Amino acid sequence: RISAINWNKISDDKDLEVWNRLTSNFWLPEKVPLSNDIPAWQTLTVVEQQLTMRVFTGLTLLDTLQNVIGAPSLMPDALTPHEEAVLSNISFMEAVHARSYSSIFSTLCQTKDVDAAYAWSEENAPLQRKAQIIQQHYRGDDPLKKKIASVFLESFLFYSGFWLPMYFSSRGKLTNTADLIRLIIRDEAVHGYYIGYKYQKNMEKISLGQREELKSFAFDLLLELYDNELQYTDELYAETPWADDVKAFLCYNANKALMNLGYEPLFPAEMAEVNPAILAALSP
Amino acid sequence: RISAINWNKISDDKDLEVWNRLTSNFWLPEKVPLSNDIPAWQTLTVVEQQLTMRVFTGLTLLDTLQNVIGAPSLMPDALTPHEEAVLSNISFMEAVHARSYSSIFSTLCQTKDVDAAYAWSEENAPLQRKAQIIQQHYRGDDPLKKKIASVFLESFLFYSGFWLPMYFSSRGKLTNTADLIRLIIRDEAVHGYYIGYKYQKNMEKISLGQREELKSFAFDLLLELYDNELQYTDELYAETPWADDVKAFLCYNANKALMNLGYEPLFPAEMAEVNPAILAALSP
Amino acid sequence: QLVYFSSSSENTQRFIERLGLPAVRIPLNERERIQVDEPYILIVPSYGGGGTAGAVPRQVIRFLNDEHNRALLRGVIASGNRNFGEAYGRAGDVIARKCGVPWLYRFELMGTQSDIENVRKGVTEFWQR
Amino acid sequence: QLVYFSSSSENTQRFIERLGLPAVRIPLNERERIQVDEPYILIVPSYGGGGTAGAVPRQVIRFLNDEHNRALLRGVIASGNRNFGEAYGRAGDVIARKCGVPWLYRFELMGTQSDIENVRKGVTEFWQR
Ligand SMILES: Cc1cc2nc3c(=O)[nH]c(=O)nc-3n(C[C@H](O)[C@H](O)[C@H](O)COP(=O)(O)O)c2cc1C
Ligand SMILES: Cc1cc2nc3c(=O)[nH]c(=O)nc-3n(C[C@H](O)[C@H](O)[C@H](O)COP(=O)(O)O)c2cc1C
Ligand SMILES: [Mn+2]
Ligand SMILES: [Mn+2]
Ligand SMILES: [Mn+2]
Ligand SMILES: [Mn+2]
Numbered sequence: 001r002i003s004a005i006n007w008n009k010i011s012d013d014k015d016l017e018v019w020n021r022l023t024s025n026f027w028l029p030e031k032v033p034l035s036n037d038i039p040a041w042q043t044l045t046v047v048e049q050q051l052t053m054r055v056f057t058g059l060t061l062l063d064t065l066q067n068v069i070g071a072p073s074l075m076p077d078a079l080t081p082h083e084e085a086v087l088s089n090i091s092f093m094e095a096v097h098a099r100s101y102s103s104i105f106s107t108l109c110q111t112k113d114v115d116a117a118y119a120w121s122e123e124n125a126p127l128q129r130k131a132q133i134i135q136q137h138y139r140g141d142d143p144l145k146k147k148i149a150s151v152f153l154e155s156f157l158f159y160s161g162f163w164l165p166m167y168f169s170s171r172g173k174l175t176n177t178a179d180l181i182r183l184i185i186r187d188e189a190v191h192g193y194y195i196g197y198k199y200q201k202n203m204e205k206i207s208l209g210q211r212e213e214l215k216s217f218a219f220d221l222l223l224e225l226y227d228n229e230l231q232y233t234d235e236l237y238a239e240t241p242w243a244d245d246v247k248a249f250l251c252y253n254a255n256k257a258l259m260n261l262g263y264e265p266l267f268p269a270e271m272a273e274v275n276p277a278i279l280a281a282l283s284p
Numbered sequence: 285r286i287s288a289i290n291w292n293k294i295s296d297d298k299d300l301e302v303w304n305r306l307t308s309n310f311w312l313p314e315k316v317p318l319s320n321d322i323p324a325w326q327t328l329t330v331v332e333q334q335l336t337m338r339v340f341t342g343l344t345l346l347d348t349l350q351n352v353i354g355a356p357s358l359m360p361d362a363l364t365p366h367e368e369a370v371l372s373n374i375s376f377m378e379a380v381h382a383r384s385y386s387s388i389f390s391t392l393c394q395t396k397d398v399d400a401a402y403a404w405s406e407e408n409a410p411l412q413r414k415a416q417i418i419q420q421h422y423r424g425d426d427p428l429k430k431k432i433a434s435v436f437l438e439s440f441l442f443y444s445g446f447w448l449p450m451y452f453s454s455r456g457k458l459t460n461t462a463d464l465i466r467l468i469i470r471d472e473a474v475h476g477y478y479i480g481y482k483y484q485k486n487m488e489k490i491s492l493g494q495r496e497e498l499k500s501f502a503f504d505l506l507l508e509l510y511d512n513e514l515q516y517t518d519e520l521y522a523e524t525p526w527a528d529d530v531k532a533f534l535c536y537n538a539n540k541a542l543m544n545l546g547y548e549p550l551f552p553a554e555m556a557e558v559n560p561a562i563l564a565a566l567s568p
Numbered sequence: 569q570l571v572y573f574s575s576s577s578e579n580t581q582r583f584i585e586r587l588g589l590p591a592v593r594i595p596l597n598e599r600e601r602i603q604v605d606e607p608y609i610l611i612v613p614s615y616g617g618g619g620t621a622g623a624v625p626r627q628v629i630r631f632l633n634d635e636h637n638r639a640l641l642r643g644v645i646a647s648g649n650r651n652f653g654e655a656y657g658r659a660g661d662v663i664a665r666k667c668g669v670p671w672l673y674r675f676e677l678m679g680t681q682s683d684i685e686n687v688r689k690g691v692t693e694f695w696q697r
Numbered sequence: 698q699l700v701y702f703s704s705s706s707e708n709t710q711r712f713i714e715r716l717g718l719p720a721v722r723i724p725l726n727e728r729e730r731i732q733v734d735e736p737y738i739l740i741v742p743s744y745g746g747g748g749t750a751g752a753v754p755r756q757v758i759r760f761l762n763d764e765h766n767r768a769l770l771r772g773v774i775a776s777g778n779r780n781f782g783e784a785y786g787r788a789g790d791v792i793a794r795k796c797g798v799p800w801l802y803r804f805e806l807m808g809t810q811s812d813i814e815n816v817r818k819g820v821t822e823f824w825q826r
């Protein structure tokens with residue numbers, strides 16, 4: 001039944017390439033000096049603090065989903081035994097991402113306010129719908145739809161939350177928290193690339209007409225998740241004037257998620273004009 | 285279905301203890317200078333080289349089994365969300381262990397000799413019988429038996445292979461390979477401890493009648509795998525005079541595997557008296 | 569003209585296909601011949617690993633090791649992803665500093681319509697000066 | 698008299714039960730403090746890495762920090778696992794070095810029958826000094 005894995009008998013060179021990239025980029029939240037952000041956490045308003053905790057409690061839920069259900073659901077559909085091993089790394093690192101959010105709470109935040117943010121996330125309708133839609137495709141019978149959902153979640157949907165530490169970084173606030181988030185972002189950039197690459201490889205062994213159906217499904221799923229994420233952004237950033245800037249950052253990342261899957265960008269330049277300070281926070 | 289994980293709301297302290305120990309002990313085969321063992325490798329006899337490759341091809345199969353089926357089969361039976369996250373690390377590190385054997389092959393060995401050793405492993409009856417018994421319980425519907433099989437494999441059975449790098453270490457040969465094996469052993473000691481601990485925690489919720497049923501099963505399975513492992517040792521170490529010391533080392537580790545599950549050692553002192561040079565190689 | 573490299577994922581390949589301009593590809597196979605006669609701008613993706621970052625792909629190095637190819641190089645465009653931080657388009661400036669050519673443009677993945685528009689206008693104005 | 702610590706896994710606890718000698722346990726609860734009156738040997742498991750980066754459990758540190766208990770310490774026995782290399786039973790020689798007491802014995806997990814018999818003979822012979 002089970003055969004011994006041979007890393008000197010590589011079928012797809014990308015498997016080894018991504019294995020080496022992900023494993024050598026290993027990190028833990030303890031390696032980041034988060035304690036240096038306490039003086040900066042003080043200067044933030046109650047609104048900004050509340051927004052911060054609600055963002056990370058939301059991201060904790062979705063990273064837990066990727067760890068428990070997300071990555072493992074892709075394993076039976078792996079083309080190579082080396083892909084199975086790479087997915088084991090991906091699953092583990094999702095637990096590291098989710099763990100790192102608790103490290104931010106433990107260092108900077110008060111237990112009372114954190115528990116309130118957890119409760120706020122549980123009752124939030126757009127976050128729960130997002131979780132449900134993505135999870136339903138993971139439990140489905142279509143291997144390719146699982147890959148679409150995974151790419152859409154962490155190459156696009158996550159950036160409604162990722163925007164905040166990037167904005168604080170440009171204002172010179174919570175720089176260490178932003179560094180930790182950039183380590184997560186660096187992981188997800190490879191995750192989306194790899195899963196998207198394996199999506200396109202599996203698209204080669206299906207009919208021309210079936211490719212057109214799945215292209216239509218992808219843009220349908222994107223726009224369903226997009227409409228939901230607009231509501232999620234409105235409810236999160238309600239007490240701030242940043243709503244429009246996050247939505248432009250969403251459209252920008254939505255295009256990148258489509259490019260990972262090998263599709264044309266859907267959103268035009270005028271809808272995807274991100275504040276230059278956010279882009280500079282990504283790439284210094 | 286999915287709840288947001290909270291590492292600041294710990295149910296069982298051991299989950300965090302083991303998470304911290306396993307993650308902080310992260311390593312890769314690339315971090316070990318395996319190429320420095322080339323001179324020592326070339327002083328070995330054809331018998332010794334052949335034995336080394338057959339040992340590591342056998343361990344590759346079993347570690348691949350642990351990555352693909354072993355650790356994932358324990359996930360649905362987890363007591364806490366934190367146990368699920370730790371099992372994600374275990375599963376990934378099983379893939380690292382299997383990958384490290386190929387790193388040894390690529391560095392020291394000839395390709396046709398490695399392929400011949402892989403073929404030998406495929407046609408070896410005791411090795412395949414060992415693989416079938418362990419997978420049988422993994423794909424079964426008794427969660428407690430999966431934990432028993434997992435502890436017996438890597439706290440007991442693996443050591444018929446682990447003996448050799450420790451022997452070479454005692455004679456001052458293949459020291460870097462020995463250092464790599466000690467990193468695998470360091471992982472497996474915690475793996476067996478944790479899985480064994482969770483086995484004991486799960487047995488607190490069942491009747492006395494079922495505990496005695498599982499105890500009788502555990503000892504019967506141990507003797508079944510042991511008798512088969514003696515045959516595996518005889519066939520593996522046929523061209524050497526080391527079989528008797530390997531078997532003594534097997535009985536020593538079998539007692540440790542039982543203790544991880546909370547059972548009394550079964551093998552007496554005279555059967556488990558390991559050559560002190562092997563023990564010194566394990567703990568300098 | 570244009571010379572480019574693209575891995576089996578083919579992000580840069582799809583960029584060139586959507587660009588429309590005539591271009592020659594540096595072969596994906598390691599041991600294949602590649603020579604150009606007309607002066608060119610190079611388009612490279614980045615592949616930086618960890619410590620000793622080999623951001624420039626092996627095929628691009630083998631291509632630039634040729635003295636005839638290197639002499640006709642005039643500019644470099646970098647492909648990649650902003651999510652890699654300071655390593656975004658790392659292959660661009662590495663070749664730019666080694667070969668003494670200017671680093672012109674940086675884009676992500678297969679490039680947006682804005683990236684295609686900026687390259688078309690950037691390339692044509694570059695050759696006329 | 699023996700003083701011992703054991704975690705929720707209770708490997709050291711099971712060793713003491715099989716030993717057959719009267720022993721007082723250092724409370725698993727960190728808030729609880731205990732005092733002994735007779736001279737004793739201390740039996741400790743090692744927990745280097747993961748816990749507090751140190752080998753000695755926090756409850757044992759609190760036990761020894763009490764000047765009353767430390768003065769009655771006569772010897773130490775370390776528990777652990779040989780698979781941890783140089784760190785095997787490292788809690789023993791840390792307490793032995795810091796308090797100036799002899800490190801008497803090292804054993805693994807819940808201990809073998811040889812370990813039990815060696816500790817039985819060891820302790821009985823020790824208290825004639
Ligand atoms: C292992 C690996 C390393 C990468 N390193 C970088 C990098 O350092 N900087 C960057 O901007 N992009 C980096 N990328 C992203 C690629 O450059 C990007 O996906 C590019 O569009 C691929 O082009 P291609 O498909 O034509 O080869 C990396 C991708 C992989 C798989
Ligand atoms: C996080 C962790 C760290 C450990 N570190 C060591 C160590 O450094 N040296 C050692 O010999 N054993 C070490 N061990 C093994 C334990 O000391 C051993 O299992 C002991 O029997 C536990 O006793 P207890 O169950 O009564 O607490 C460690 C175990 C864990 C879980
Ligand atoms: Mn993630
Ligand atoms: Mn991911
Ligand atoms: Mn293993
Ligand atoms: Mn293991």
